[PDB]
């Protein structure tokens, strides 16, 4: 569960400015109409307490290259029966009638259902996969309030970091696409905050950073 080189180094660099966080925040114009971005906090959205409804919202920026990491703050008691976090194309539906793991339900999105600890992608046709893989006896892995999402558009992978622990590659095959951060929620009044952490080009990293990484090990 050791963070791969690039991720570790990116996480040791200074977090993206307040300006960058806003540029990569939730898109108030690309959302389910049961969700609204907080006027007093553009990095956080609020879901209306609508019964039998699953709702999503996409981030403003679709990523096509480079390594990108963003932090999700989702209060554990505001998740309910279906809380999913991941990425999707511009075509993934943002709303669904009924409670379900919307993100990852079609080939248009990839997501980690926090409660079931299941990875979903085109789930109507492909079964979910347990994640982290080390779980046994269908035991729950409680994802805390905050955790990190790492999207590497160079290698085409998606992975998550919890409590500083890398949980491994979740999805592969994302190269060549334009992906947006997304979550599907069913909890009345839940508020999810997304803070862009940083981005890293696929170029040789400075020796200084490489050394500090080896030392942190």
């Amino acid at each position: 569960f050791v963070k791969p080189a690039r991720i570790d180094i990116l996480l040791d660099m200074p977090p993206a400015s307040r300006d960058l966080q806003l540029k990569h925040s939730w898109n108030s114009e690309d959302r389910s109409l049961n969700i609204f971005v907080k006027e007093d906090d553009k990095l956080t959205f609020h879901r209306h307490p609508v019964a039998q409804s699953t709702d999503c919202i996409r981030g403003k920026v679709g990523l096509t290259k480079g390594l990108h990491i963003w932090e999700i703050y989702w209060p554990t008691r505001q998740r309910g029966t279906h809380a999913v976090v991941g990425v999707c194309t511009a075509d993934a539906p943002l709303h669904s009638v009924g409670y379900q793991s919307l993100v990852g339900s079609t080939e248009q999105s990839w997501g980690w259902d926090l409660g079931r600890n299941k990875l979903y992608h085109d789930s109507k046709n492909c079964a979910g996969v347990t994640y982290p893989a080390i779980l046994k006896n269908d035991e729950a892995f409680l994802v805390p309030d905050k955790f990190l999402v790492a999207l590497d558009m160079d290698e085409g992978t998606l992975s998550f970091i919890v409590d500083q622990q890398y949980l491994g590659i979740a999805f592969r095959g994302l190269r060549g696409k334009k992906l947006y951060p997304i979550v599907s929620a069913v909890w009345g009044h839940c508020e999810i905050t997304m803070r862009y952490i940083g981005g890293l080009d696929p170029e040789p990293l400075p020796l200084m950073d490489l050394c500090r990484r080896t030392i942190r090990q």
């Binding site: 080189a5 170029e203 040789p204 400075p206 020796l207 200084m208 490489l210 050394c211 080896t214 030392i215």
Partner: protein
């Protein structure tokens, strides 16, 4: 074309000038307002540094998957001090 980088213990490393410019410090020393001598960087560290120069130039000017730059735990601390000093 080439420049000579000399370690504290007297090893002379002959590297392509463009490669040596990977280091902000060496770049500045080669400009001014030939050789470069290092009082506190020993050969086992300077040699590693030169390999980094080769690595950096080769993979910065390419779109092919960049491999890992090997750094043994034993040298990491000395390498770090050298990297900071050389700005690279």
């Amino acid at each position: 074309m080439y420049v000579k980088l000399i370690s504290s213990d007297g090893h002379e490393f002959i590297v392509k000038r463009e490669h040596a410019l990977t280091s902000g410090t060496i770049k500045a020393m080669l400009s001014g307002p030939n050789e470069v001598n290092f009082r506190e960087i020993p050969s086992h560290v300077l040699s590693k540094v030169c390999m980094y120069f080769t690595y950096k130039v080769r993979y910065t000017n390419s779109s092919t998957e960049i491999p890992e730059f090997p750094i043994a735990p034993e040298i990491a601390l000395e390498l770090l001090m050298a990297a900071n000093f050389l700005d690279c």
